[PDB]
Amino acid sequence: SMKIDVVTIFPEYLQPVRQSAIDAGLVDVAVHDLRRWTHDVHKSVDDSPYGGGPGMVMKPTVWGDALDEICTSETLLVVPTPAGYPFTQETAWQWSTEDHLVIACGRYEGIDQRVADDAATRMRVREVSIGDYVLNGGEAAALVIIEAVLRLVPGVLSLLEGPSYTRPPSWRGMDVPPVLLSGDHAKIAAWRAEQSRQRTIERRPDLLGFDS
């Protein structure tokens, strides 16, 4: 059984989690509005950066109070950031056996670095990037991470995959490769292995230790 808490200034953005595993009760997902932990009438969560620069930075005081209430020493705190360590399939396998994930979603130019630093004195913290592009907020990264982790959780149960096919065997004058219709398991496995390695050298040569 896993608990996932997501903290955000846009809780409505996390509604896509509800095409659930949540229904099966293996995981509980709760979404929290960061503005709940403010105290001023304007409920301000951001301020200009020290040292100059474009944009705004999320204030540490509000985040500190929220994480104080939600986290324990056993929590794995996940902080999405384009400057993070890479989130990969290996990471997903690792987090699939955790009891409690808390995902802190940033906006603007991100969260004051002292929030993560303070948290690390009490719990395990992971700052992670989901890919080499820039999003407007951490909410889409939270949805990606939750999906990748949940399909590996017990109870739900290298190379690029080659192409797949289904009926009919001929469509618009395009045929399913005849080996797949041949019923020869050894020949099919061999062909599928070759397609995978061929697609990998063309699209992701780095996976096989080549340039680019």
By CB under 6 A, tell whether 19 contacts ligand SAM.
Answer: no
Structure tokens at 161: 């995959």
CB 139 within 8 A of CB 14: yes
Q: Which residues 98-127 are close enough to bind ligand SAM by CB under 6 A?
A: 105-107, 109-110
Cα(197)–Cα(36) distance, integer angstroms = 51
Between CA 202 and CA 68 the distance in angstroms is 48
Could you tell which of ligand SAM, a copy of itself, none binds residue 105, using a CB distance below 5 to 8 A set by kind?
A: ligand SAM
In whole angstroms, give the CA distance from residue 157 to residue 115. 35
Interface with a copy of itself includes 57 (CB under 8 A)? yes
Site for a copy of itself contains 124 (CB under 8 A)? no
* Interface with a copy of itself in residues 37-56 (CB under 8 A): 46-53, 56
Structural element, H or E, at residue 85: strand 76-86
DSSP labels, 154-173: TTT----------S-SEETT
Amino acid, res. 42: H
Compute the half-sphere exposure of residue 9: CA atoms within 13 Å on the CB side of its CA: 17
* Number of amino acids touching a copy of itself (CB under 8 A): 83
| Contacting range for ligand SAM; rule: CB under 6 A; set: 17-25, 76-84, 187-195, 201-209 | 76-84
138 binds, among ligand SAM, a copy of itself, none (CB under 5 to 8 A by kind): ligand SAM
Q: Contact positions toward ligand SAM, by CB under 6 A?
A: 80-83, 105-107, 109-110, 129-131, 133-138, 141, 161, 164
> Residues marked as binding?
80, 106, 129-135
> Residues marked as binding for S-adenosyl-L-homocysteine?
80, 106, 129-131, 133, 135
